[PDB]
From a paper:
Although PBI1 consists mainly of the DUF1110 domain, the molecular nature of this domain was unknown. Therefore, we determined its tertiary structure of PBI1. The crystal structure was solved at a resolution of 1.84 Å. PBI1 is composed of a four-helix bundle with a diameter of approximately 19 Å and a length of about 70 Å. There are six molecules in the asymmetric unit. The root mean square differences (r.m.s.d.) between each monomer are from 0.15 to 0.85 Å. We observed no large conformational change induced by crystal packing. The four helices of PBI1 are arranged in an up-down-up-down topology, and the bundle is leftward turning. The interfaces between the helices consist of hydrophobic residues, whereas hydrophilic residues are exposed on the surfaces that interact with the aqueous environment. In particular, the CC domain of Rx is very similar in structure to PBI1, with a high Z-score of 4.5.
We identified PBI1 (PUB44-INTERACTING 1), which belongs to a protein family with the DUF1110 domain. PBI1 interacts with WRKY45 and negatively regulates its activity. Therefore, it appears that PBI1 keeps WRKY45 in an inactive state in the absence of pathogen attack, and that PUB44-mediated degradation of PBI1 activates immunity via the de-suppression of WRKY45. PBI1 is degraded upon perception of chitin, and this is suppressed by silencing of PUB44 or expression of XopP, indicating that PBI1 degradation depends on PUB44.
Author numbering: 3 to 187
Write the structure that this text describes.
């Protein structure tokens, strides 16, 4: 009923920082993916590869900070499940079983559980976007393929769609994590 609650707050505070970093990296990645990419000239292909490598660097940052946010939020939940348990040998089965003396942590925990889902969906969508950008890199090395620029256009569209999905998940996840922070601050 004491120390774990501070640790819980610190983890929620740090999770919200990670989430805000994720949103910034995803947004910057998308700025690189707006205009068309072309393979039919070596200079245009090089321009496109550079844009892709910039986007990829932002997506690695986003993925890392998503992985950190998930870990932090999970540890916070477990702090509460163990900390809130009446018997020192056992942990609570789920956050909604927390006693009403820990209402702040219980309210925060409910948000962290859904933020966890938001983070996992964002992570998956980022990996999808990466997959599309990897496909474009393959297509840029086959300029003689008929219709190669149509295939690039297809993959670029899907990359943006996947990334826009992640952006939406991160918006919600960040909102939940800041809500959780507010619950315990």
């Amino acid at each position: 009923a004491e120390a774990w609650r501070s640790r819980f707050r610190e983890r929620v505070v740090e999770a919200a920082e990670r989430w805000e970093s994720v949103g910034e990296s995803l947004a910057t990645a998308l700025t690189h993916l707006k205009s068309p990419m072309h393979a039919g000239d070596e200079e245009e292909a090089a321009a496109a590869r550079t844009r892709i490598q910039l986007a990829m660097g932002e997506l690695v940052d986003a993925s890392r900070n998503l992985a950190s946010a998930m870990s932090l939020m999970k540890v916070a939940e477990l702090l509460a499940l163990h900390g809130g348990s009446v018997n020192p040998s056992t942990h609570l089965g789920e956050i909604s079983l927390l006693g009403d003396q820990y209402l702040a942590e219980r309210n925060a925990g409910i948000k962290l559980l859904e933020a966890g889902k938001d983070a996992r969906k964002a992570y998956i969508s980022v990996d999808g976007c990466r997959g599309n950008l990897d496909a474009i890199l393959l297509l840029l090395d086959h300029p003689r393929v008929p219709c190669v620029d149509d295939f690039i256009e297809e993959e670029l569209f899907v990359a943006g769609d996947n990334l826009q999905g992640a952006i939406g998940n991160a918006k919600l996840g960040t909102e939940r994590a800041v809500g959780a922070r507010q619950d315990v601050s």
